[PDB]
Design a binder for this molecule. Structure first.
Ligand SMILES: OC[C@H]1O[C@@H](O)[C@H](O)[C@@H](O)[C@@H]1O
Ligand SMILES: OC[C@H]1O[C@@H](O)[C@H](O)[C@@H](O)[C@@H]1O
Ligand SMILES: OC[C@H]1O[C@@H](O)[C@H](O)[C@@H](O)[C@@H]1O
Ligand SMILES: OC[C@H]1O[C@@H](O)[C@H](O)[C@@H](O)[C@@H]1O
Ligand SMILES: OC[C@H]1O[C@H](O)[C@H](O)[C@@H](O)[C@@H]1O
Ligand SMILES: OC[C@H]1O[C@H](O)[C@H](O)[C@@H](O)[C@@H]1O
Ligand SMILES: OC[C@H]1O[C@H](O)[C@H](O)[C@@H](O)[C@@H]1O
Ligand SMILES: OC[C@H]1O[C@H](O)[C@H](O)[C@@H](O)[C@@H]1O
Ligand SMILES: OC[C@H]1O[C@H](O)[C@H](O)[C@@H](O)[C@@H]1O
Ligand SMILES: OC[C@H]1O[C@H](O)[C@H](O)[C@@H](O)[C@@H]1O
Ligand SMILES: [Ca+2]
Ligand SMILES: [Mg+2]
Ligand SMILES: [Mg+2]
Ligand SMILES: [Mg+2]
Ligand SMILES: [Mg+2]
Ligand SMILES: [Mg+2]
Ligand SMILES: [Mg+2]
Ligand SMILES: [Mg+2]
Ligand SMILES: [Mg+2]
Length: 1059
C-alpha cells in the first residue's frame, strides 16, 4: 500500500509521468494541478494536499478520482492559480478508512512572471568591456548588460538581471559614440547601434549592412522570475525578413533550414524516426544565418529556438535556468569574412576539431553480428578476396555483455574494490581465445580497431559477480551522480539501460577509475579507440553531479564529458586512437567522429542522413559518418546500396554497419554480403569504383580534414555555406560541397535517373569525363544507378594518389605512408593557389600555384620542392611544347612511354588532360604548357536535339562525336564561357565531312552566321575551321542547327574557344 507524487517526474521534455505537477514550473495566473497515485485499488481511499502559501497554512485541498490503471488509482488535486512571488509548499497524502497516511513531499515552487529590459540609463566604457545600466519593465531589479569582443567580429552579450554579476573582459580594439538617445560601438568589422529609450540593439557590419536586430517593438530581452531569489528562464527576440534561412542547431534530420520551426536544444535517443519526431542525439545552441551571422547561446541548459514559428517576422530563443539568480545569460553574435569563417569563430569559442590520423578517413567495416574470432577472420578474408582495402574495423559484440570491459567467455578471479585487471589475469576461451592475436591480424590487414562502450554500469537485477563488485565500489565512492536524495542516480526503468548507474564524468576520480578498468585494452590488447555509444541518459530535475550542476544543465553536456573523457584517455596511451560517437553538444567536435545513429534501409532515411550531415557541418561537427544504406530494416535494395555507396565515398567518414546480433541470413552491409542478399553481382564493381576513387582522392580529403582542424571549414557543406547570397542555394539538401573544390550531387530518390544539379557561379567540370558546365543554373544530369555527378570548381587544384593507369577508380590500395603516383588535377582559371598537406612527408605544407593565361596560350604551374615525383593533369587542349625551368620536356606518345620517362608530357584525348611529370627536386620548379587553350567543349556532351552520338571513326577528342547532324530540326547546343570576359573570340569547329562540302548555321546568343565546312578526304579525316564569334562575360548560348538552306552530313567532334 502506498501513495506517490513527484512534481517533475523524469523531467522529460516530450512526455510526462502520471504523477507530476502541471505546469511543472507555474507562472502567475496558471491553474496548478497535482497528479497523485495510490495503491492498491480499494474502496475507502481519501487523497488530499496539506500546504502553505508564503508560509501561511492553507485549507487542505481534496483530490478527485481521475482513473484506474493496473494496481493503481490516479487522482487530481487542484491548487488553483497564484500570483508572481508566491511561494507554495505542499505535501500530498493518501489514506484508506482514516488509517495510515502515506505521503510525498514537501515540495516547493516559486511563482514567476516575465520582466524585460526597458531603457538604458547610463553607459560605462571600461576599455575591455562596456556596461549598459538599465531599467526594467516590472519588478525591483537594476539590470546590467555587458558587451565585450571575443574578437573584433565576434560580439558577446552578458546579462545580469539583478546587476550583481559582472561580464568578462574582451578585446579593446573598439570605439564608442555615446549620446543621450543612442550608443554606437564600432570595430573595423562591426557597428553595433543601441537605442537607449527603449533599449534596442542592431548589429551591422562595419559598412552598415544589417546582420540582425532585436524585435521592432523593443522590450525584447527578458527573464522569468519570482522577483526574489529565482530566475527560471531567459529570452530575447529578433526581427527577421521573410527570406532569411537558418542553418545548423547541431545535427538535424527533418530539414537543413529551420525557418518555421521551434527547435529544441535537447539531446535524445530516438530510434529510426528522428526526422518525423524532429529529435536528435546531437543538439547545439548555435545557428548560422544566410544573412551572414551566427548566434551562439552559451549554455548547456535546454533552449527553444522559435524560428519565425510564432510570428512570421520574429525569431526568439527561450533558455531554461535552474533558478540560480547568479547565472547570467551569455550569447554571441558572430560575424566573419565568410560563412565558414563564422563557423571558425564559433570553434574559437567552443573548441577546434582535433585532427584525426589518416586511417580514420578510409573505409570503416562494422557489423553487430561479428561476435567471435572466426567472424573476424572471415570478415578480413572476405575484404581481401573482394579487393576491399579498408582501414577501420569495429567490434560491438565483443564483451561479456555485463561489465563491458572483459572479453566474452573470458574466465578469471573476480576483483573487489574496483581493482583493474591486466591481460595476464584472464584465461581467454570460446569466442575469443587470443584477443591480442586477433587485433594483430586486423593490424596485419592494414586496419585499426575500435571497441564499443556505454557510459553506464548495467544493472538488470541479475547476479553477476564482477558487475556486482563494481557497482558496490562505485556506490561507496560516490562515482555515480546523485538522485537528489543521496542514492545513486539510475537511468529511468523504461529507457535503454534502464536501472543502470551512470558514471559521473564530471568526477575526475570516477573517470580515472572507469578508464583504469579499460586500460589493458589499449596497453596490452592494442586497440585503436572506442565506439562510445549512448549518453542521452540524464533525466530528473534533482539529479546532481560532482561539479554541483543538476539534471537540467547536465543533460546536454553529459554525452560530451563522456565522449571527451574516453577520447583523451585512449589518445594518452595510443596517439593514433580515434573515437566514434553519436551524442553531444557544443564542444563535441574536439573529440572524434560522430555518426548519424540508427536508421532504416530506405531512401527516406538516406535523405534524412544527408540532412543530418549538412546540419552537423554548419554546427562545427565536420568528421561525420552515417551507416551507409541504413543499418536495420529490410535489407537494402541493390539500387539503394549503390546510391548510398556513392554518397558515402564522398562523405567525411565512410562506414558500413548493421544492427542484428545473430541473423540468418547475414545482415552485413558489406559489398560481398550485399551481392549475396540481392543477387546483383554488379554491386561489387560499383562499390570498388567508389572506394578506389575515395582512396585516389585521399590526399585531397586529408588536406580538407586538416583545413577543418585549423580553419573551421567543414569537409561536407550545404551550398549556402559557400554561396549565401545565391537564392537558388538556400534550401538545397540533395547536393553539397566536399572539400573546397568538389560539388557532389547524390541521387537520394528511389527510381531516379535524371538528377537536377544547381550549379553556382563559375564553370564546373565533370571529374569523371571532362564535360564542361557553366554556372548559374540548374542542369539535368543523366545518372544511371552506377553514376554520381561530381564537378570541379574553376581553378581547382586537386591532389590525388594514382596508379600507373592514372584514371579515377583504379585501386591504389590502403598504404597511408607513401604515394604511388602523386598527381595534381588542375582546372585552370585565372590565378589559383592550393596548400597541400603532405602528411606522407612529415606533414610539410606544399604551396602550389597555377597561372592560367589562355589569352597567350599558356598555363604556368609553380611547383614547390617535393619529396616525390609529381604528375600534373591539366585540363586543356594539347600543348605544342612543355617546359620545366625553361627546358623542353619530351612528348610521350603513349601512357606506357610516359610511365617509363623520368620527365615529359602526354595528352589524354578522352579526358582532355595534359599529363606533366616532374622529377623530385629540393627546389621549386617552373612548369609551362605552351600553345594550349581551354579544353574543348565536346559535341557529344552538348544539348542534343534529334541527333545521336557515335565513336566509330578514329581521331575524335572526348568519347566520340555527334553523328550526321544532317536534317532540319537537328541541333547541338553548347553552354560556352568567355575565357577572359566580354570580347570577340575565335571558335574552332572540329568535324569530318567525308562526302562533300557542308554548311551549318550557328547562333551566338541569338545572332546567326552560316559556316562552311569543306569536305575531308574521308570519314577518318578531321578538319578544323575557325569561326569569329562575339561573347559576353560568363555563359554564352551557342547553337548549331541544320536549317533548310544547309547541306551535307558531318560528324561533329568539338569546339574550342580561343583568342
Ligand atoms: O485533517 C483533515 C484531512 O483528513 C483526511 O482524513 C481527510 O480525508 C482529508 O480530506 C482532510 O483534509
Ligand atoms: O511493489 C509496490 C509497487 O506497487 C505499484 O502499484 C506502485 O505504483 C509502485 O510504485 C510500487 O513500487
Ligand atoms: O515567444 C516567447 C514565449 O514563448 C512561449 O512559448 C513561452 O511559454 C513564453 O513564456 C515566452 O514568453
Ligand atoms: O539496435 C541498437 C539500438 O537499440 C535500441 O534499443 C537503443 O535504444 C539504441 O540506443 C541502440 O542504438
Ligand atoms: O471514485 C471512485 C473510487 O475511488 C477510489 O477507488 C476510492 O477509494 C473509492 O471509494 C471510490 O469509489
Ligand atoms: O553487443 C553490444 C551492444 O550492441 C547493441 O547495439 C545493443 O544495443 C546492446 O544491447 C549490446 O550490448
Ligand atoms: O545472459 C547474459 C550472458 O550472455 C552470454 O552467455 C555472455 O557470454 C555472458 O557473459 C552473459 O552473462
Ligand atoms: O564475474 C562473474 C564470473 O565471470 C567469469 O565467469 C569468472 O571466471 C568467474 O570467476 C566470475 O564469478
Ligand atoms: O558532364 C557530361 C555528361 O556526363 C554524363 O554523360 C551525363 O549523363 C550527362 O548528363 C552530362 O552532361
Ligand atoms: O551521313 C553521315 C554519315 O556518313 C557515313 O555513313 C559515316 O560513316 C558516318 O559516320 C556519318 O555520320
Ligand atoms: Ca568529341
Ligand atoms: Mg470515502
Ligand atoms: Mg523534401
Ligand atoms: Mg576569426
Ligand atoms: Mg556472429
Ligand atoms: Mg598500437
Ligand atoms: Mg559526490
Ligand atoms: Mg591572369
Ligand atoms: Mg613509375
Amino acid at each position: 500500500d502506498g501513495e506517490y507524487h513527484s512534481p517533475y517526474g523524469d523531467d522529460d521534455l516530450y512526455t510526462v509521468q502520471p504523477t507530476e505537477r502541471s505546469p511543472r514550473d507555474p507562472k502567475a495566473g496558471e491553474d496548478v494541478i497535482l497528479n497523485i497515485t495510490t495503491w492498491p485499488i480499494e474502496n475507502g481511499q481519501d487523497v488530499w494536499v496539506e500546504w502553505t502559501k508564503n508560509g501561511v497554512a492553507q485549507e487542505n485541498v481534496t483530490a478527485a478520482y481521475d482513473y484506474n490503471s493496473g494496481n493503481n488509482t490516479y487522482w487530481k488535486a487542484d491548487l488553483g492559480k497564484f500570483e508572481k512571488g508566491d511561494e507554495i509548499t505542499y505535501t500530498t497524502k493518501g489514506s484508506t478508512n482514516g488509517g495510515t497516511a502515506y505521503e510525498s513531499g514537501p515540495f516547493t515552487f516559486y511563482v514567476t512572471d516575465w520582466e524585460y529590459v526597458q531603457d538604458v540609463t547610463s553607459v560605462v566604457d571600461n576599455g575591455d568591456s562596456i556596461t549598459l545600466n538599465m531599467t526594467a519593465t516590472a519588478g525591483d531589479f537594476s539590470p546590467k548588460l555587458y558587451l565585450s569582443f571575443e574578437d573584433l567580429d565576434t560580439l558577446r552579450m552578458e546579462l545580469s538581471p539583478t546587476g550583481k554579476e559582472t561580464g568578462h573582459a574582451g578585446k579593446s580594439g573598439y570605439t564608442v559614440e555615446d549620446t543621450a538617445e543612442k550608443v554606437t560601438v564600432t570595430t573595423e568589422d562591426l557597428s553595433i547601434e543601441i537605442q537607449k529609450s527603449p533599449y534596442r540593439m542592431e548589429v551591422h557590419q562595419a559598412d552598415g549592412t544589417l546582420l540582425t536586430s532585436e524585435y521592432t517593438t523593443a522590450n525584447s530581452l527578458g527573464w522569468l522570475t519570482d522577483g526574489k531569489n529565482v530566475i527560471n528562464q531567459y529570452q530575447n527576440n529578433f526581427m527577421t525578413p521573410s527570406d532569411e534561412a537558418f542553418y545548423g542547431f547541431g545535427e538535424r534530420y527533418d530539414t537543413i533550414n529551420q525557418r518555421g520551426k521551434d527547435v529544441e536544444t535537447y539531446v535524445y535517443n530516438e530510434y529510426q524516426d528522428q526526422a518525423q519526431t524532429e529529435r536528435t542525439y546531437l543538439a547545439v545552441p548555435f545557428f548560422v544565418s544566410a544573412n551572414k551571422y551566427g548566434m551562439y547561446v552559451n549554455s548547456d541548459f535546454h533552449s527553444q529556438f522559435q524560428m519565425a514559428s510564432k510570428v512570421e517576422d520574429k525569431y526568439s530563443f527561450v533558455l531554461d535556468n535552474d533558478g540560480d539568480m547568479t547565472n547570467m545569460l551569455d550569447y554571441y553574435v558572430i560575424s566573419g569574412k565568410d560563412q565558414n569563417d563564422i563557423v571558425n569563430n564559433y570553434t574559437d569559442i567552443t573548441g577546434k576539431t582535433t585532427l584525426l590520423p589518416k586511417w580514420a578517413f578510409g573505409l570503416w567495416m562494422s557489423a553487430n553480428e561479428w561476435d567471435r574470432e572466426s567472424d573476424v577472420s572471415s570478415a578480413l578474408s572476405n575484404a581481401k578476396a573482394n579487393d576491399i582495402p579498408a582501414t577501420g574495423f569495429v567490434l560491438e559484440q565483443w564483451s561479456d555483455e555485463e561489465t563491458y570491459y572483459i572479453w566474452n567467455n573470458a574466465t578469471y578471479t573476480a576483483k573487489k574494490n574496483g581493482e583493474a585487471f591486466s591481460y595476464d589475469d584472464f584465461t581467454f576461451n570460446g569466442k575469443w581465445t587470443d584477443p591480442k592475436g586477433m587485433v594483430d591480424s586486423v593490424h596485419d590487414a592494414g586496419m585499426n580497431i575500435v571497441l564499443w562502450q556505454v557510459p553506464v554500469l548495467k544493472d538488470d537485477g541479475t547476479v553477476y559477480e564482477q558487475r556486482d563488485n563494481d557497482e558496490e565500489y562505485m556506490i561507496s565512492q560516490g562515482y555515480s551522480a546523485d538522485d537528489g536524495t543521496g542514492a545513486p542516480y539510475r537511468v529511468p526503468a523504461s529507457q535503454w539501460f534502464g536501472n543502470g548507474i551512470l558514471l559521473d564524468f564530471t568526477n575526475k576520480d570516477a573517470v580515472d577509475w572507469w578508464t583504469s578498468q579499460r586500460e589493458y585494452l589499449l596497453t596490452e590488447v592494442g586497440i585503436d579507440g572506442f565506439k562510445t555509444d549512448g549518453g542521452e541518459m540524464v533525466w530528473g530535475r534533482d539529479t546532481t553531479f560532482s561539479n554541483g550542476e543538476k539534471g537540467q544543465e547536465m543533460r546536454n553536456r553529459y554525452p560530451t564529458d563522456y565522449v571527451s573523457s574516453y577520447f583523451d584517455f585512449a589518445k594518452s596511451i595510443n596517439p593514433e586512437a580515434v573515437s566514434f560517437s553519436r551524442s553531444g553538444t557544443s564542444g563535441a567536435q574536439k573529440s572524434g567522429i560522430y555518426w548519424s545513429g540508427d536508421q532504416t534501409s530506405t531512401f527516406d532515411s538516406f535523405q534524412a542522413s544527408l540532412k543530418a550531415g549538412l546540419s552537423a557541418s554548419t554546427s562545427g561537427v565536420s568528421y561525420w559518418a552515417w551507416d551507409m544504406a541504413g543499418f536495420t530494416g529490410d535489407y537494402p535494395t541493390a539500387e539503394l546500396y549503390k546510391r548510398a555507396t556513392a554518397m558515402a565515398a564522398f562523405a567525411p567518414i565512410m562506414q558500413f554497419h548493421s544492427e542484428k546480433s545473430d541473423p540468418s541470413p547475414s545482415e552485413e552491409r558489406s559489398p560481398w554480403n550485399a551481392v549475396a542478399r540481392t543477387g546483383d553481382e554488379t554491386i561489387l564493381p560499383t562499390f570498388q569504383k567508389y572506394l578506389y576513387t575515395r582512396m585516389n582522392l585521399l590526399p585531397y580529403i586529408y588536406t580538407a580534414a586538416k583545413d577543418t582542424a585549423d580553419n573551421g571549414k567543414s569537409m561536407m557543406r550545404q551550398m549556402a555555406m559557400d554561396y549565401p547570397e545565391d537564392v537558388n542555394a538556400r534550401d538545397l539538401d540533395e547536393q553539397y560541397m566536399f572539400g573546397d573544390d568538389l560539388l557532389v550531387a547524390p541521387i537520394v530518390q528511389e527510381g531516379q535517373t535524371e538528377k537536377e544539379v544547381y550549379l553556382p557561379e563559375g564553370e564546373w567540370v565533370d571529374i569523371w569525363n571532362g564535360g564542361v558546365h557553366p554556372g548559374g543554373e540548374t542542369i539535368s544530369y543523366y545518372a544511371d544507378v552506377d553514376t554520381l555527378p561530381v564537378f570541379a570548381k574553376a581553378g581547382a587544384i586537386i591532389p590525388m594518389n594514382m596508379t600507373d593507369g592514372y584514371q579515377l577508380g583504379q585501386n591504389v590500395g590502403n598504404d597511408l605512408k607513401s604515394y604511388d603516383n602523386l598527381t595534381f588535377r588542375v582546372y585552370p582559371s585565372g590565378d589559383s593557389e592550393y596548400s597541400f598537406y603532405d602528411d606522407v612527408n612529415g606533414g610539410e605544407m606544399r604551396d602550389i600555384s597555377v597561372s592560367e593565361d589562355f589569352a597567350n596560350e599558356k598555363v604556368s604551374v609553380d611547383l614547390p620542392a617535393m619529396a616525390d615525383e609529381t604528375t600534373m593533369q591539366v585540363f586543356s587542349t594539347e600543348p605544342t611544347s612543355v617546359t620545366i625551368d625553361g627546358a623542353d620536356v619530351a612528348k610521350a606518345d603513349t601512357l606506357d612511354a610516359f610511365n617509363e620517362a623520368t620527365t615529359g608530357y602526354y595528352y589524354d584525348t578522352v579526358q582532355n588532360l595534359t599529363y606533366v611529370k616532374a622529377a623530385a627536386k629540393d627546389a621549386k620548379q617552373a612548369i609551362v604548357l605552351n600553345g594550349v587553350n581551354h579544353a574543348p567543349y565536346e559535341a557529344e556532351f552538348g544539348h542534343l536535339t534529334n541527333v545521336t552520338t557515335a565513336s566509330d571513326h578514329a581521331g575524335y577528342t572526348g568519347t566520340g562525336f555527334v553523328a550526321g547532324f544532317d536534317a532540319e530540326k537537328e541541333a547541338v547546343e553548347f553552354d560556352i564561357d568567355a575565357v577572359d570576359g566580354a570580347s570577340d573570340y575565335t571558335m574552332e569547329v572540329r568535324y569530318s565531312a567525308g562526302v562533300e562540302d557542308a554548311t551549318r548555321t550557328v547562333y551566338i546568343n541569338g545572332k546567326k552566321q552560316q559556316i562552311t565546312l569543306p569536305k575531308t578526304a574521308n570519314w577518318d579525316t578531321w578538319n578544323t575551321v575557325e569561326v569569329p564569334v562575339t561573347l559576353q562575360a560568363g555563359n554564352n548560348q551557342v547553337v548549331f542547327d541544320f536549317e533548310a538552306d544547309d547541306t551535307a552530313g558531318i560528324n561533329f567532334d568539338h569546339v574550342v574557344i580561343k583568342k
